[PDB]
Amino acid sequence: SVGPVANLKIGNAAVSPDGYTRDAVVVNGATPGPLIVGNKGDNFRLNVIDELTNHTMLKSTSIHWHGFFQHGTNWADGGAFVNQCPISSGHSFSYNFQAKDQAGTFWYHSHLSTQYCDGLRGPFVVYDPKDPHKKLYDVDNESTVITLEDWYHTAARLGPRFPLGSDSTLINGLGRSATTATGDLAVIKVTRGKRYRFRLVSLSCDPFYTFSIDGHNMTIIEADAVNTKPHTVDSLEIFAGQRYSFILNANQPVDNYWVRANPNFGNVGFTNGINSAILRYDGAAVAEPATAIPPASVTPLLETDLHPLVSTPVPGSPVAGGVDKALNFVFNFDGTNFFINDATFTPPSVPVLLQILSGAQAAQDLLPSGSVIPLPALSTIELSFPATANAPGVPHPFHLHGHTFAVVRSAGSTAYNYEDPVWRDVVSTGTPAAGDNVTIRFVTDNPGPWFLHCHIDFHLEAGFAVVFAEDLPGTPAANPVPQSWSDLCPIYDALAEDDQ
Amino acid sequence: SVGPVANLKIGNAAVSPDGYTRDAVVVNGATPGPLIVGNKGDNFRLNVIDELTNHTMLKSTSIHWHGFFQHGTNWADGGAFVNQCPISSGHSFSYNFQAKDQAGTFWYHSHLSTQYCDGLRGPFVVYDPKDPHKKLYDVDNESTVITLEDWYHTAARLGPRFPLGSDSTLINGLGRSATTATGDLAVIKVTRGKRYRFRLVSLSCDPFYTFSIDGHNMTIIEADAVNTKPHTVDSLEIFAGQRYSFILNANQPVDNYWVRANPNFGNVGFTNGINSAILRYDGAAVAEPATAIPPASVTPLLETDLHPLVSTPVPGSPVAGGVDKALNFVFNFDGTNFFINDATFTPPSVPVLLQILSGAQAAQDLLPSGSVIPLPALSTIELSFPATANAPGVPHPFHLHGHTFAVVRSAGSTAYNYEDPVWRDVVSTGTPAAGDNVTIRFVTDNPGPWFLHCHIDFHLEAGFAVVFAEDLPGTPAANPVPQSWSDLCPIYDALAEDDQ
Numbered sequence A, B: 001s002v003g004p005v006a007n008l009k010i011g012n013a014a015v016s017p018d019g020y021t022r023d024a025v026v027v028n029g030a031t032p033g034p035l036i037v038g039n040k041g042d043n044f045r046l047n048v049i050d051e052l053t054n055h056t057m058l059k060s061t062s063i064h065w066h067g068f069f070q071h072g073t074n075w076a077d078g079g080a081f082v083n084q085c086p087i088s089s090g091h092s093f094s095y096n097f098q099a100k101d102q103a104g105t106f107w108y109h110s111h112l113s114t115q116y117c118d119g120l121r122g123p124f125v126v127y128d129p130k131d132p133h134k135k136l137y138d139v140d141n142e143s144t145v146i147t148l149e150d151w152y153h154t155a156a157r158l159g160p161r162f163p164l165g166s167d168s169t170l171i172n173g174l175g176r177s178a179t180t181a182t183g184d185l186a187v188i189k190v191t192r193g194k195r196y197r198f199r200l201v202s203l204s205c206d207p208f209y210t211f212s213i214d215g216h217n218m219t220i221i222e223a224d225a226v227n228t229k230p231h232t233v234d235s236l237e238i239f240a241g242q243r244y245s246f247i248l249n250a251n252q253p254v255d256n257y258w259v260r261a262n263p264n265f266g267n268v269g270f271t272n273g274i275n276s277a278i279l280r281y282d283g284a285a286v287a288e289p290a291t292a293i294p295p296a297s298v299t300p301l302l303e304t305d306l307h308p309l310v311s312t313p314v315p316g317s318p319v320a321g322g323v324d325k326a327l328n329f330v331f332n333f334d335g336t337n338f339f340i341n342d343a344t345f346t347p348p349s350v351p352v353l354l355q356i357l358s359g360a361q362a363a364q365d366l367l368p369s370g371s372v373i374p375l376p377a378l379s380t381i382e383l384s385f386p387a388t389a390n391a392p393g394v395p396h397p398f399h400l401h402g403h404t405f406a407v408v409r410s411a412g413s414t415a416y417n418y419e420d421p422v423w424r425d426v427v428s429t430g431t432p433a434a435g436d437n438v439t440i441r442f443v444t445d446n447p448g449p450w451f452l453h454c455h456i457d458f459h460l461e462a463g464f465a466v467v468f469a470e471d472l473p474g475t476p477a478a479n480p481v482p483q484s485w486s487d488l489c490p491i492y493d494a495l496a497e498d499d500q
């Protein structure tokens, strides 16, 4: 691992995570990128050195630290053309931010177009020396982080606008490809009698995974970097950019057990060990687990079963629309672009934050017109995301920057929970077939412009996003910017198209 | 089409339904086999002529007419080693039976080991000249039958015991294969302004399909050959061996529309037009429908939404166990074989029917021991099939020969419907994740031995079956047998193994 003070060299390399060689975007030579680490409260100084040479996967970059509040450091949040202009090749830019009152499992990824699909993605863990769950486990380190990723043989800008499936699933960077009949299996080692805090991170550009480990249950203790009451399940669905920590007790016989991460579309199933890794007990033979009918889950995770470890009052009052500001989002799609309330997000040439600092007076004046929505400061907010056939590609996992939110109503559920709903940062908005109306709440304690979007990267690219201008009046005073940030736009704007 | 009196020549041929050539078992030169037709009440004389030469796909055969009650013609039901010994190559055998009080959508398939997966399967329609639904449609013929098949490039006896997905989905015998990047799309033709009765039949060996037609709803009017009240949906799941008729109104703009049949595992999705066919309006270009994000279903079929067209009483009284005989089935599996109440089905050398005709008094005395269960004559029966992780491969679609049954409790539902539940002959038993306990009722009005088994053919092969000895004492009188049937066993038993 690296961090909390680190260089992250972004470059192009030929890689073969699934046994097929292709050009990718790598971090310190690898994809997925290295584990970034720190402790609760640490100041991070992550110096991103762009050495990219390949315009087809973009020479520029911008890194988002998924899950971090960035209070007073909006300029470091990483959303291209929202929080910064991209870094240009041949240049470095240091993201300097704090894990203020935050600890748990996060990740980092390019937030420039679909570039993270081409490889710029990795896990990020902030340890808590006073973790309230510490007595539940013996091992928590680099080897207990489990990353899931969709991998494509055709590069993001060379294939379909909306890929209809991936070519392999990579678990900790490795996996088998059905289409090329190639690839190796990741091995996750355990020692009988020890308990493990596995930190499961979806780096997916698109599919959700159904994740399980043969012969072992998973005791969930964290969702999207917020501590939960322990809740034991035998499988879970994990959407793009969600995280869970779960305890695994290595109390089964010494053997090899299949770890399964099955995508919702693409190659679904486990023929030849696709969508799989190996949980290997110390002393077990160096072999694959036996070919088996995949086991049936009896206790799959329901989001409605997750509850905050600490009593956390839900903002507003226990009635629909009982907040200061309630907003409903109507989704649509025209075959090319997605729309939220009849607006499709197209990245403005002046980043949203810069427009604000330059003195734009109201959110209606901010570009792109209709996509930037003001929120009043120090207020309770309720957002509803009713699932609709007008926005195909369901279920859409929505993500809000700068905040965690209470999931008052989950997908697949008609209940509203104003008492003890889970807190998270990525939520499935479900399906119109279930008449879903996923509803979330939060407080506007964080001045600045924050992305809200579908975390399916191909949908974001197709404009399925809005930006909240939260506390516009207070944004300049809250977010002083470094000169290096101010220089990004002139440098980027000087590039010819082929050098972007 | 052929029938109700016809020759069916069963042979081996090289075929390429998805553009990859492999050896198969065909019927009158084709797989899937020709449509067999007749009218309600017709006597069928189906002369099965076995010309097979390839032992790898079996030289013997036995054909089951799926959905027919076979009242008094148990010997014609086709279950290998239950209702007959197999037909031997170089011989013929005439299945002579009546569509007595039956009309609707059926199918036929080999019922010897996994031979139907190698190609011996086709649709079978019994028309009703007085169809109570006839005013709802203009066109109902050979061009409105839609068959769905899973297709494998490796033969059933050469591949895994438990395949995890197929190489292609065939709709009306054609489709694209992601394995080989080959195949053509079936075209289903409609004329604007006409209403169509499509008869959708699953000939699947394993996967269930999620079926839909872009831009068109489907008004279900029949399930498993029993008329329903019309019920309109925009997508449906269809399990192995189920049938639905639905009305399609061709009132949309003249164009090409995607027809979708997406398996539950294997290649899931629509990359390059796999799992697809084309609904083509007269006058539309000879072209594919536009590439598209697959549309989201707003009104998927629920089995609990289907009700019999005519008021039909539910056998027994409206309380759990309110029947003459109630039986619960405990499923299990040991890695190789499936078990039902601790017994795995292995075919006996003397067919169960012949054991009965030869004077076996108790179902206790019938072989295989533990797998043959007596049912009292003229009694109300309730069967439950509680889903269990002890039998992986869920959801298991169970099928009962000789009967249709009331689905008092469906998968994915906790309700018991004793008033107007759907009648069918294949039912998904769901998952233990849902606490499913699918429960069915029927009356024992049909003396003879009837298979009850999972219709995933690989699971049947692994023993996931029982046989009901229904009205044992009345069986010989009810089922007089032709000399040709009595000759099958001596002829078959004379074969060397390589000639079977």
Ligand SMILES: *[C@@H]1O[C@H](CO)[C@@H](O[C@@H]2O[C@H](CO)[C@@H](O[C@@H]3O[C@H](CO[C@H]4O[C@H](CO[C@H]5O[C@H](CO)[C@@H](O)[C@H](O)[C@@H]5O)[C@@H](O)[C@H](O[C@H]5O[C@H](CO)[C@@H](O)[C@H](O)[C@@H]5O)[C@@H]4O)[C@@H](O)[C@H](O[C@H]4O[C@H](CO)[C@@H](O)[C@H](O)[C@@H]4O)[C@@H]3O)[C@H](O)[C@H]2NC(C)=O)[C@H](O)[C@H]1NC(C)=O
Pocket: A320, A321, A322, A323, A324, A325, A326, A327, A328, A384, A385, A386, A436, A437
């Ligand atoms: C998914 O869930 C969402 C959320 O529940 C749901 O949308 C709500 O649907 C209900 C029921 O249809 C709506 O209720 C109606 O509202 C009518 C007009 O009220 C308006 O006034 C609101 C102003 O409230 C203040 O405080 C709120 C915070 O609560 C704050 O936002 C405002 O600043 C405001 O000061 C307001 O919320 C609402 O505003 C709109 O929000 C967007 C902005 O993006 C706007 O563009 C939309 O047009 C939306 O309306 C609006 O201005 C009200 O007249 C009506 O009352 C009728 O019916 C009741 C029923 O009993 C009768 O008793 C009564 O006599 C009236 O005839 C009714 O209460 C509610 O407004 C929606 N909420 C939102 C936020 O949009 C979706 O429909 C769900 N979707 C699906 C598919 O299920």
Ligand SMILES: *[C@@H]1O[C@H](CO)[C@@H](O[C@@H]2O[C@H](CO)[C@@H](O[C@@H]3O[C@H](CO[C@H]4O[C@H](CO)[C@@H](O)[C@H](O[C@H]5O[C@H](CO)[C@@H](O)[C@H](O)[C@@H]5O)[C@@H]4O)[C@@H](O)[C@H](O[C@H]4O[C@H](CO)[C@@H](O)[C@H](O)[C@@H]4O)[C@@H]3O)[C@H](O)[C@H]2NC(C)=O)[C@H](O)[C@H]1NC(C)=O
Pocket: A022, A023, A024, A054, A055, A056, A057, A153, A154, A155, A158, A179, A180
């Ligand atoms: C910068 O970064 C980009 C993005 O990563 C790099 O882009 C790469 O460009 C190269 C060279 O143009 C690409 O190779 C080509 O791929 C095309 C399209 O391929 C696919 O579709 C085919 C048509 O339907 C299909 O047949 C292919 O499938 C077969 O082949 C693959 C192997 O490629 C095999 O794995 C399968 O089993 C199949 O058998 C495939 O899925 C392809 O048509 C090209 O082949 C033609 O041209 C080559 C040139 O050598 C020629 O030899 C052949 O005869 C053929 O006519 C060619 O292979 C590559 O795919 C791109 N990479 C990605 C990730 O998209 C770019 O190279 C980087 N620049 C630099 C300087 O590094």
Ligand SMILES: *[C@@H]1O[C@H](CO)[C@@H](O[C@@H]2O[C@H](CO)[C@@H](O[C@@H]3O[C@H](CO[C@H]4O[C@H](CO[C@H]5O[C@H](CO)[C@@H](O)[C@H](O)[C@@H]5O)[C@@H](O)[C@H](O[C@H]5O[C@H](CO)[C@@H](O)[C@H](O)[C@@H]5O)[C@@H]4O)[C@@H](O)[C@H](O)[C@@H]3O)[C@H](O)[C@H]2NC(C)=O)[C@H](O)[C@H]1NC(C)=O
Pocket: A181, A272, B020, B022, B023, B024, B054, B055, B056, B057, B153, B154, B155, B158, B179, B180
């Ligand atoms: C009586 O009926 C018999 C059954 O129908 C018929 O049997 C045929 O017998 C011939 C002769 O032996 C077979 O042909 C031979 O096939 C083998 C095996 O090849 C196939 O399987 C391999 C392995 O697949 C697995 O592993 C790979 C790699 O890990 C995975 O990708 C895969 O998913 C599996 O897990 C596979 O790689 C092969 O695929 C390659 O080749 C095919 C074309 O052959 C390409 O389409 C494909 O893209 C790929 O390049 C292939 O699927 C092979 O090793 C031999 O070289 C030879 O080809 C027939 O397959 C078999 N037919 C069937 C339907 O099974 C008898 O012939 C018949 N009797 C008579 C007298 O006719």
Ligand SMILES: *[C@@H]1O[C@H](CO)[C@@H](O[C@@H]2O[C@H](CO)[C@@H](O[C@@H]3O[C@H](CO[C@H]4O[C@H](CO[C@H]5O[C@H](CO)[C@@H](O)[C@H](O)[C@@H]5O)[C@@H](O)[C@H](O[C@H]5O[C@H](CO)[C@@H](O)[C@H](O)[C@@H]5O)[C@@H]4O)[C@@H](O)[C@H](O)[C@@H]3O)[C@H](O)[C@H]2NC(C)=O)[C@H](O)[C@H]1NC(C)=O
Pocket: B320, B321, B322, B323, B324, B325, B326, B327, B328, B384, B385, B386, B436, B437
């Ligand atoms: C899925 O649904 C299943 C159906 O509801 C359910 O199985 C049922 O479970 C309930 C709740 O525990 C049981 O109820 C308990 O029954 C006993 C009395 O049991 C004995 O008597 C009944 C009635 O016998 C007479 O009537 C029936 C018709 O209703 C005739 O068939 C019978 O011949 C008699 O005339 C009888 O059904 C029981 O049958 C046995 O079944 C097998 C062998 O076939 C045995 O292994 C089993 O243990 C049971 O003994 C039995 O002889 C009573 O003491 C309790 O107070 C309570 O009423 C039901 O018996 C049971 N029904 C059946 C048919 O098994 C599953 O539990 C459910 N599974 C899941 C996971 O949800």
Ligand SMILES: *[C@@H]1O[C@H](CO)[C@@H](O)[C@H](O)[C@H]1NC(C)=O
Pocket: A215, A216, A217, A234, A298, A299
């Ligand atoms: C996991 O949980 C299920 C349901 O709680 C239980 O039946 C199973 O035995 C457990 N497996 C373990 C502890 O390995």
Ligand SMILES: *[C@@H]1O[C@H](CO)[C@@H](O)[C@H](O)[C@H]1NC(C)=O
Pocket: B215, B216, B217, B234, B298, B299
């Ligand atoms: C099909 O039914 C749906 C749901 O009832 C409806 O919204 C849609 O307009 C219908 N489409 C047709 C008739 O083409």
Ligand SMILES: [Cu+2]
Pocket: A064, A066, A109, A241, A399, A455
């Ligand atoms: Cu993210």
Ligand SMILES: [Cu+2]
Pocket: A064, A065, A066, A067, A399, A400, A401
């Ligand atoms: Cu984020």
Ligand SMILES: [Cu+2]
Pocket: A393, A395, A396, A397, A454, A455, A456, A459, A460, A464
């Ligand atoms: Cu989306």
Ligand SMILES: [Cu+2]
Pocket: A064, A079, A111, A399, A401, A451, A453
């Ligand atoms: Cu984002």
Ligand SMILES: [Cu+2]
Pocket: B064, B066, B109, B241, B399, B455
């Ligand atoms: Cu059948």
Ligand SMILES: [Cu+2]
Pocket: B064, B065, B066, B067, B399, B400, B401
């Ligand atoms: Cu049958």
Ligand SMILES: [Cu+2]
Pocket: B393, B395, B396, B397, B454, B455, B456, B459, B460, B464
């Ligand atoms: Cu089964």
Ligand SMILES: [Cu+2]
Pocket: B064, B079, B111, B399, B401, B451, B453
């Ligand atoms: Cu059968």
